[PDB]
């Protein structure tokens with residue numbers, strides 16, 4: 494029963510710091526890109542779209558552009574890991590990571606930013 | 609650029625009656641069911657889990673499953689269609705359909721129930 498898990502579901506972060514949020518999923522083998530979809534959204538803003546190996550800059554929402562990246566190296570370890578640099582106020586909310594790799598599952602993560 | 613689209617996003621249905629809600633998705637030529645995942649949820653309750661041609665009635669939530677079905681016939685036309693018979697009160701709320709077929713997309717649909 495393909496599960497995604499969140500190590501931490503609540504992130505308290507400093508304004509202008511850097512953050513990495515993590516979704517873990519089972520990779521019992523060597524990651525097969527033919528099977529892999531990784532999506533990250535925050536309140537209906539598209540953040541990352543990784544589709545079978547394909548990463549499309551064009552669909553990424555204005556805010557996250559040149560601040561958000563998916564750590565590819567980490568994928569191979571079954572860790573969809575979103576790095577957001579220079580955390581702003583508008584960055585606080587519920588994040589969703591959606592994964593499809595054989596089965597499919599998704600999880601939610603809260604971010605709080607201090608002023 | 610895989611899109612899921614909804615004909616109607618709001619359904620107002622009468623208590624006890626029957627409803628079909630639909631999610632449409634592109635099906636170039638002949639559906640490959642081995643590559644297809646169709647998921648329906650309502651406020652975190654599992655309604656339908658159709659993974660590669662098997663439906664999973666292990667944990668799928670007993671109030672629905674009792675009245676909820678995926679019309680497989682319609683899949684061939686790129687129509688994920690959830691049929692609920694004898695609409696109850698607990699059936700109102702925001703459903704989500706999540707589809708994976710090459711790409712992946714989801715949509716939300718609101719249901720309201722009347723009782724006259």
Ligand SMILES: Cc1c(Nc2nccc3cc(CN4CC[C@@H](O)C4)cnc23)cccc1-c1cccc(-c2nc3cc(CN4CC[C@@H](C(=O)O)C4)cc(C=N)c3o2)c1C
Pocket residue numbers: 494495496497530531532539542543544591592593596597598599610611612613645646647657658659706707708711712713714
């Ligand atoms: C998550 C998931 C499921 N979930 C489940 N399936 C079966 C059983 C499932 C059972 C559970 C329950 N438990 C929880 C714990 C464990 O016990 C399992 C949960 N979940 C399931 C099914 C099918 C697809 C997905 C999924 C996977 C990966 C990615 C995306 C995705 N959405 C996008 C949305 C967009 C949005 N844009 C915006 C406009 C829109 C448009 O085109 O209309 C496109 C992009 C892009 C671009 N890439 C998008 O990718 C999606 C939906």
